[PDB]
Amino acid sequence: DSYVHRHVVTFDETNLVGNVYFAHYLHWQGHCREHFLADHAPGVMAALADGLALVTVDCHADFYAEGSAFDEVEVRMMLDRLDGHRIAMSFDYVRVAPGPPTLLAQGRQTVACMRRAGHGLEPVEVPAELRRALSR
Amino acid sequence: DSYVHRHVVTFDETNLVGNVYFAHYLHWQGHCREHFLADHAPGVMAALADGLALVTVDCHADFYAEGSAFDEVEVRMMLDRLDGHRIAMSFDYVRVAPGPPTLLAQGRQTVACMRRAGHGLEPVEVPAELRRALSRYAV
Amino acid sequence: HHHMPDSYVHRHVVTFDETNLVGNVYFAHYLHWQGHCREHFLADHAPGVMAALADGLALVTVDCHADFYAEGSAFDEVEVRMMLDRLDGHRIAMSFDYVRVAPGPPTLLAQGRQTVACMRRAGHGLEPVEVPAELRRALSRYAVV
Amino acid sequence: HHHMPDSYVHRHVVTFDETNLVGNVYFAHYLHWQGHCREHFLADHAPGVMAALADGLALVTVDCHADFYAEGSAFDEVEVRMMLDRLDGHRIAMSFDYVRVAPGPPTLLAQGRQTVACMRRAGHGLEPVEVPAELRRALSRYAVVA
Ligand SMILES: C/C=C/C=C/C=C/C=C/C=C/C=C/C(C)=O
Structure with missing residues (x-):
């Protein structure tokens, strides 16, 4: 069961080599986790103001095949693990058009849920709405 | 005596055409105005965390010659106009290395000083430190 | 102003990486969106031109411009509405309305303009080429009004 | 004299466009900075390789990684400190410390790693090439030690 974020590669994500510059794959992790929050945990999205x-605790990407401008990429996100305050997600980046489905890359990211009164910030339980959305 | 912000073009600013993607020239206006504050208006720099x-009210760029990865570009900023709450700046983008000095582009931007209130962002006076710095260091 | 556009529409959801510490969309992103919009237009309405860009x-870009009216925020749905202003041998002048369509009422965030030249890489640097017929026809049909 | 090996230092000043509404540096920028650092390294220490990248x-990039420890802010002066982890054929593994040196006390913001492969454009694909001698030479001055 994966959450799918669809991304069309733009020219500004390419570089003189002709492929997608590596750091953009990490932005797409962000676009994907944020779109998930908006789609399935809006209350947590709103709570970010409060x-x-x-x-982000860490992130990782493995690169397999080159992406190009106008490629339609599915950023497929899965829950790897939820533990107290941390959420580990994994990502497949699959080009679905043009041509045959092609795994461009894979990735991983860990996020920590924190509350921040005073000067520092402290671990808090993953909110219920988010924990609920994550299981689906 | 324009204010000079030095920028080395990185690969992530290029694109498959082989040149600097046009929108990066606008980011460089931002980098340049921030560097200006750190150099010449550090009290204003502090107020930006407070x-x-x-x-930005408006911005503009005219493109003349292509930039490439590893080009050393001088983003040369000049004060065009101050009013009550607005600052208009102009920019020459000059490649100084490799090869001979080359005007790549020119640009302009108007910025407003604002504070966030209950309704949203509201206009405030340009701080005197900034008006003086611009009149002296970017003319 | 209107929910319904009369122009080519590129839809963009604002992400956190397009914001900044002020809490709004950083101004330079609006210029990237002009590029995203014109590329999406090619994929939708001039796919033969899209292929020529690999050939x-x-x-x-000759020039570009933006006027900013109201702040954009993370997770705003923005319509980047593109219109043809002028076609001149090898140059295309396009204008843009940036309309927040959600949340809240339709709001003009910004407007913009850009001139682009059709060029071919040659043994002289870049050389002007006439706007491809497919693109000229696509712009007259999909980006006028 | 220097028990600990030196690292290559790429200086980066955080700009507003690298921040986000939370008020800190958006995480993905730290990966861009690895790119900026490795390119600055080539311009300083392997300029022949820098020229071959236009030729x-x-x-x-084969893989990359970042661990985040403390928030970066606009106007922070960050040293992106690069070291060679290993050179394995056509592959180069580099590691990165991201240290805020101003304002305030030196603070480790983050650490990172990246593996790169040296390749040449053949047809419509790329093929492995030996790490150029100049780059091998330049990176070995910043080797991580056992
Ligand atoms: C099955 C997929 C589960 C995904 C869970 C996603 C959690 C994402 C959290 C994203 C947080 C983003 C935070 C900011 C500040 O950008």
């Missing part, structure tokens, strides 16, 4: 922080 | 915001 | 054709 | 040589 006092909830979703902080 | 509720002051520089809000 | 020596280049769209070179 | 058909390409550095192709």
